[PDB]
Amino acid sequence: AEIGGDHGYNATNIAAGQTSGAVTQIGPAVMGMVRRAIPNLIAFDICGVQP
Amino acid sequence: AGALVEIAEGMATSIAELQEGFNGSTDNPWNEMGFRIDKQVIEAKSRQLKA
Amino acid sequence: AGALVEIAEGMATSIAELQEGFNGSTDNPWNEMGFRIDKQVIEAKSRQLKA
């Protein structure tokens, strides 16, 4: 009875490919990377520049 | 008040792969479904006149 | 109430030109920024029914 098993739902177990069953999977795939958006500016039409 | 919130989540794979007697386990039955099928009987009532 | 206002000003040139040990100065470090890059791992929870 070769049980498939699963990760203990621990984050380290998932990230390391650990599995309580027989096989240990390679990696936790890649669903993408999020980056925080740069906040927008207010422009300089409210204050004179005068370089 | 938000003290008692409403949730919904699935089953861990370690508990779902072996369901109702796999790999020697027990006391973990499935959840089953079905249909009842109940009937209603009507009666034809009469209605008449004379001239 | 206007008692405590919010302001923001730049750094004086005499302090900015000599930063991080210039002209014999000390204990005037620059301010530095970095990126963290941390990951989240999710797990596929199962679900099953019987008839």
CSV table of C-alpha atoms in Angstrom, one decimal:
chain,number,residue,atom,x,y,z
A,1,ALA,CA,0.0,0.0,0.0
A,2,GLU,CA,2.1,2.8,-1.3
A,3,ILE,CA,0.3,5.8,0.2
A,4,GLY,CA,0.6,9.1,-1.7
A,5,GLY,CA,0.8,11.1,1.5
A,6,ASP,CA,1.0,14.9,1.8
A,7,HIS,CA,2.9,17.7,3.4
A,8,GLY,CA,2.1,18.3,7.1
A,9,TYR,CA,0.7,21.6,5.8
A,10,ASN,CA,3.7,23.2,7.5
A,11,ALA,CA,5.2,26.0,5.3
A,12,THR,CA,8.7,24.5,5.5
A,13,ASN,CA,7.4,21.1,4.6
A,14,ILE,CA,5.7,22.4,1.5
A,15,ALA,CA,8.7,24.5,0.5
A,16,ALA,CA,11.2,21.7,1.0
A,17,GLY,CA,9.1,19.1,-0.9
A,18,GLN,CA,8.7,17.0,2.2
A,19,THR,CA,5.8,14.5,2.3
A,20,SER,CA,4.6,12.1,5.0
A,21,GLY,CA,3.9,9.5,2.4
A,22,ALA,CA,6.2,7.6,0.0
A,23,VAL,CA,7.3,10.1,-2.7
A,24,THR,CA,8.7,13.6,-2.1
A,25,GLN,CA,7.8,16.1,-4.8
A,26,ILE,CA,10.4,18.3,-6.4
A,27,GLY,CA,9.3,21.8,-5.6
A,28,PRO,CA,6.2,23.9,-4.8
A,29,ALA,CA,5.9,25.2,-8.4
A,30,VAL,CA,5.9,28.9,-9.1
A,31,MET,CA,2.6,30.8,-9.3
A,32,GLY,CA,4.3,34.2,-9.7
A,33,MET,CA,5.8,37.1,-7.8
A,34,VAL,CA,4.0,40.1,-6.5
A,35,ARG,CA,5.6,43.5,-6.1
A,36,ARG,CA,4.1,46.5,-4.3
A,37,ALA,CA,3.0,49.2,-6.8
A,38,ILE,CA,4.9,52.4,-6.8
A,39,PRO,CA,2.6,55.2,-5.4
A,40,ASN,CA,1.8,57.9,-7.9
A,41,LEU,CA,3.0,61.5,-7.7
A,42,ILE,CA,1.0,64.7,-7.6
A,43,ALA,CA,2.9,66.6,-10.3
A,44,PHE,CA,4.3,70.2,-10.0
A,45,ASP,CA,1.5,72.3,-11.4
A,46,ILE,CA,0.5,73.3,-7.9
A,47,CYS,CA,3.9,74.8,-7.1
A,48,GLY,CA,6.2,76.7,-9.5
A,49,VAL,CA,9.4,75.0,-10.4
A,50,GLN,CA,11.8,77.8,-11.2
A,51,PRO,CA,14.9,75.6,-11.6
B,1,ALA,CA,-20.3,41.6,16.2
B,2,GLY,CA,-17.9,39.4,14.2
B,3,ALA,CA,-17.1,37.1,17.1
B,4,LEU,CA,-18.7,34.1,15.3
B,5,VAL,CA,-17.7,34.2,11.6
B,6,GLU,CA,-18.6,31.7,8.9
B,7,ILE,CA,-16.0,29.5,7.3
B,8,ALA,CA,-15.5,26.7,4.7
B,9,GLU,CA,-12.5,24.6,4.0
B,10,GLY,CA,-11.5,21.2,2.5
B,11,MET,CA,-10.0,18.0,3.7
B,12,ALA,CA,-6.3,17.4,4.2
B,13,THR,CA,-4.9,14.9,1.6
B,14,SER,CA,-3.5,12.7,4.4
B,15,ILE,CA,-7.1,12.3,5.7
B,16,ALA,CA,-8.8,12.1,2.3
B,17,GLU,CA,-6.6,9.6,0.4
B,18,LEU,CA,-7.3,7.0,3.1
B,19,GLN,CA,-11.1,7.3,3.6
B,20,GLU,CA,-13.1,4.3,4.9
B,21,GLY,CA,-10.5,1.6,5.1
B,22,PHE,CA,-7.3,2.2,3.1
B,23,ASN,CA,-3.8,1.4,4.3
B,24,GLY,CA,-5.4,-0.4,7.3
B,25,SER,CA,-7.2,2.7,8.6
B,26,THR,CA,-10.8,2.7,9.8
B,27,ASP,CA,-13.4,4.8,11.6
B,28,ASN,CA,-13.2,7.4,8.8
B,29,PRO,CA,-16.2,7.0,6.7
B,30,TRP,CA,-17.3,9.0,3.7
B,31,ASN,CA,-20.2,11.5,3.4
B,32,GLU,CA,-22.9,10.1,1.2
B,33,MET,CA,-25.9,11.4,-0.8
B,34,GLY,CA,-29.1,10.2,-2.4
B,35,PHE,CA,-32.6,11.0,-3.4
B,36,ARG,CA,-36.0,10.5,-1.6
B,37,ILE,CA,-38.7,10.7,-4.2
B,38,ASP,CA,-42.1,11.3,-2.5
B,39,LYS,CA,-45.5,11.5,-4.2
B,40,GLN,CA,-48.7,13.5,-4.1
B,41,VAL,CA,-52.1,12.1,-5.2
B,42,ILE,CA,-54.9,14.4,-6.3
B,43,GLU,CA,-58.6,13.7,-6.9
B,44,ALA,CA,-60.8,14.8,-9.8
B,45,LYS,CA,-63.8,16.7,-8.3
B,46,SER,CA,-67.0,17.0,-10.3
B,47,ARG,CA,-69.2,20.0,-11.2
B,48,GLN,CA,-72.6,20.0,-12.9
B,49,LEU,CA,-75.8,21.8,-13.7
B,50,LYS,CA,-79.2,21.2,-15.4
B,51,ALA,CA,-81.6,23.4,-17.4
C,1,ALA,CA,-6.3,72.2,16.1
C,2,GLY,CA,-3.1,73.3,14.2
C,3,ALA,CA,-0.9,72.9,17.3
C,4,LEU,CA,1.1,70.0,15.7
C,5,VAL,CA,1.7,70.4,11.9
C,6,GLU,CA,3.3,67.9,9.5
C,7,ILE,CA,6.5,69.0,7.8
C,8,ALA,CA,9.5,67.5,5.9
C,9,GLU,CA,12.8,69.1,4.9
C,10,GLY,CA,16.0,68.0,3.3
C,11,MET,CA,19.4,67.6,4.8
C,12,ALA,CA,21.8,70.5,5.2
C,13,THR,CA,24.6,70.6,2.6
C,14,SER,CA,27.4,70.7,5.2
C,15,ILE,CA,26.2,67.4,6.5
C,16,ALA,CA,25.3,65.8,3.2
C,17,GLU,CA,28.6,66.5,1.4
C,18,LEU,CA,30.6,64.8,4.2
C,19,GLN,CA,28.8,61.5,4.9
C,20,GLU,CA,30.2,58.2,6.1
C,21,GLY,CA,33.6,59.3,7.2
C,22,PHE,CA,34.6,62.2,4.9
C,23,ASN,CA,37.0,64.9,6.1
C,24,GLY,CA,37.7,62.9,9.2
C,25,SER,CA,34.1,62.7,10.4
C,26,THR,CA,32.6,59.6,12.0
C,27,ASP,CA,29.3,58.1,13.0
C,28,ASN,CA,27.4,59.8,10.1
C,29,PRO,CA,26.2,56.9,8.0
C,30,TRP,CA,24.1,57.0,4.9
C,31,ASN,CA,20.6,55.6,4.9
C,32,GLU,CA,20.2,52.5,2.8
C,33,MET,CA,17.3,50.5,1.3
C,34,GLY,CA,17.0,46.8,0.3
C,35,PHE,CA,14.6,44.3,-0.9
C,36,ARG,CA,13.3,41.3,1.1
C,37,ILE,CA,11.8,38.7,-1.3
C,38,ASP,CA,9.8,36.3,0.9
C,39,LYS,CA,7.6,33.4,-0.3
C,40,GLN,CA,4.2,32.0,0.5
C,41,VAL,CA,3.3,28.3,0.0
C,42,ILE,CA,-0.2,26.9,-0.3
C,43,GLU,CA,-1.5,23.3,-0.3
C,44,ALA,CA,-4.1,21.5,-2.3
C,45,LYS,CA,-6.8,20.5,0.1
C,46,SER,CA,-9.0,17.6,-1.0
C,47,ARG,CA,-12.8,17.1,-1.1
C,48,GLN,CA,-14.9,14.0,-1.8
C,49,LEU,CA,-18.4,12.6,-1.7
C,50,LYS,CA,-20.1,9.2,-2.1
C,51,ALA,CA,-23.4,7.9,-3.4
